[PDB]
Amino acid sequence: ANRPSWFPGSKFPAHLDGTLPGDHGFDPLSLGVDPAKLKWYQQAELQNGRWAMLGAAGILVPDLLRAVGMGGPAAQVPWFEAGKYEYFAPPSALFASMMFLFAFVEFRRLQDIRKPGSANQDPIFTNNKLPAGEVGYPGGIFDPLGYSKGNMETLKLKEIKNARLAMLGFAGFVAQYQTTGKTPLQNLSDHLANPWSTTVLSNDLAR
Amino acid sequence: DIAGLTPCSESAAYAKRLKNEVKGLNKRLKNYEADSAPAIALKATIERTQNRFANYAKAGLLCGADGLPHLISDPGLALKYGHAGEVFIPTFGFLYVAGWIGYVGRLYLNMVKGEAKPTEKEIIIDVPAALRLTWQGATWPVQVVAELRANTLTEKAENITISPR
C-alpha cells in the first residue's frame, strides 16, 4: 500500500520511508542509512544524473547526426575520439577555462547545500535574486519556462527516473566501448542484426 | 685489510686447509667399498666441508696467516667494511631473546606474587599462564621503556631490605 518497490514483494528499507523523490526503497548496501549522508547522497544523485543526461545526449546525438550524415566532420568524430579532434585552443586551455567557470557555479551551489537559501542573490545586481527553492532545485531563472508550478512532484519523479536511466546509459556506453571498442549506435546496430548471438556473453566468449 | 687479516678468498693457507682436510677424508673413503654406508657418509662430510670452506670466504671472513677466519668487533670497522654479520648483528639478536626471556620471567613472577600461595606456583609451574605470557615478551623493549618512563620497572629504596652496614 506504499511507493513502488525496486523488487515487488520485498520490504522497504527503514531509512527509505518515501520522503525522497523516487524513493522506491533501494539501498541493499545500506549506503544512505545515515540521514545526514542520505542528504548529501541525494544531491549527488541529482547532480551526477543531470550531468549524465547531458553526457548521454552529448554522445548519442553527435553519433545520430553522423549516422544520418547531417552532422559535420565534427559529428563524424566518435565521442571517444573528440578529445584528439582539433577546435581552436589546445585541450589544456579548454579544461583550465572550464575549471575557473566551474569553480564559481560549484561554490555558489555548495553555499546552498551548506547553508540552505544563502546563495540566491545576484552578487553584481542586488535586485536580481532566485526565489526560495529546495536544495538541488534552484528554480527562478533556473526555471525560465516556469514549469515549477505545473505538477512539480511528478515532473521531479520524471527527472530522477530519466537521470537514473541516463546514468546507467553512460555506464553502458563506456563498458561497450571498453569491450567492443565501437560507438553506441554501432553496438546497437550489431545487436539488431543478429540479436541472438551478439549478446555480451557471446562477444566476451569470442574475445 | 683491517689488521693485516687477508680475506679467506685470497688466503692461500685457507685454500691449503681445504686441500689437506678433504685429502684426509678422501683417504678414509678409499678403505671402504663405493656403496657402503661408511662411504656414503664420508662423501657427505667431504661435500659439507667443501660447502662450508666456501660459504665462509663468500661471507668475506678475513683470516690471518693461520688461514682461520677472524671476526671484527668494532661497530665502525664491522659496519664501514661490511663485516656486520659477525659479532655486530649477532649481538642484538641475543640481546632481544635475552631480554625476552627475562621480561617474560618477571611478568610471571609478578603475577604469581599475590596469587594465593606464590611459593607453590614456582615448583608446580602454572603451564597455562606461563604459556599466556611467553608471547607477551615479543614487544618487551616497548613495554620495558614504558615502565622506565613511568617508574614501575624498579622498586623504591625504602621497600628493599638491606644488610646492616
Partner: protein, 214 residues
C-alpha cells in the same frame, strides 16, 4: 562493537573511545594510559606517513604503467632523483633532519604539555594556531577546510576512515618492501603476475619466503 576477531576477549583499557578500537591489545601493550596516549599519536603519525607514501609509490607507478608519467620504481627513484637533482645524500638528509626535527620538537612538547605551543609570544604571530585539539589531531592550521567541525559524528566517521586506511597503508608499505625483497619487481608487476596465474604465483612459490631445503 566490531572486534579484530569475533569472540576475542576485549582487554579492559581499550573501551570503545579511540578511532578503530576493535579491542586488539593481545600483548597488553597499551595497558598504561600514558603509553596508550603516546601509542595513539604514534599510530596516527605512522598511518598518515604511510598513506602519503604508498600514494607516492602506487599512484605515480599506475600512471607510469599507463604512459601518463615516467616516475622510476620506488626502489630506484632515490638514485634517479639524486643524479637528477645533483644534491649529495649527506646535505639533502641533514637539511631534512633539521626541518623534521623542529616540527617534531613542537609536536613532542605539545604532547608533554598539551596545548603548550600556543604560549603567548612564542612563534611570532601564529602561536595560537599551535594549540591542538585532542591527541593526534592538531585542528586549526591543519584541517583548514574545517571538515572535522561539521558534527560530532562526522568527526567520528572521518577519524575511523583515517585509522582503517592508515593501518591498511602501513601494512601495504611492509608488503611493497617484502614483495620487492622476494619477487625483485614493482608492486603492480607482482599483482599483474599473480592475476596471470593466481594459483601458481604466491609467496610460497617465490624461493625466499620459505627456504624449503627438505
Amino acid at each position: 562493537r566490531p572486534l579484530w576477531m569475533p569472540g576475542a576477549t576485549v582487554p579492559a583499557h581499550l573501551k570503545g573511545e579511540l578511532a578503530g578500537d576493535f579491542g586488539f591489545d593481545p600483548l597488553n601493550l597499551g595497558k598504561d594510559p600514558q603509553a596508550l596516549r603516546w601509542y595513539q599519536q604514534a599510530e596516527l603519525v605512522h598511518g598518515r606517513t604511510a598513506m602519503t607514501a604508498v600514494a607516492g609509490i602506487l599512484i605515480p607507478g599506475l600512471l607510469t604503467k599507463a604512459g601518463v608519467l615516467n616516475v622510476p620504481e620506488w626502489y630506484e627513484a632515490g638514485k634517479v632523483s639524486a643524479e637528477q637533482t645533483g644534491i649529495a645524500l649527506g646535505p639533502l638528509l641533514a637539511v631534512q633532519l633539521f626541518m623534521c626535527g623542529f616540527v617534531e620538537g613542537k609536536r613532542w612538547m605539545d604532547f608533554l604539555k598539551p596545548g603548550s605551543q600556543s604560549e603567548a609570544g612564542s612563534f611570532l604571530g601564529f602561536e595560537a594556531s599551535f594549540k591542538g585539539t585532542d591527541n593526534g589531531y592538531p585542528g586549526g592550521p591543519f584541517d583548514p577546510m574545517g571538515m572535522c567541525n561539521e558534527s560530532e559524528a562526522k568527526t567520528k566517521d572521518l577519524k575511523l576512515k583515517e585509522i582503517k586506511n592508515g593501518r591498511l597503508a602501513m601494512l601495504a608499505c611492509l608488503g611493497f618492501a617484502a614483495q620487492y625483497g622476494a619477487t625483485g619487481k614493482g608492486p603492480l608487476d607482482n599483482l599483474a603476475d599473480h592475476l596471470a596465474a593466481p594459483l601458481k604465483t604466491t609467496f610460497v612459490d617465490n624461493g625466499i619466503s620459505i627456504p624449503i631445503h627438505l
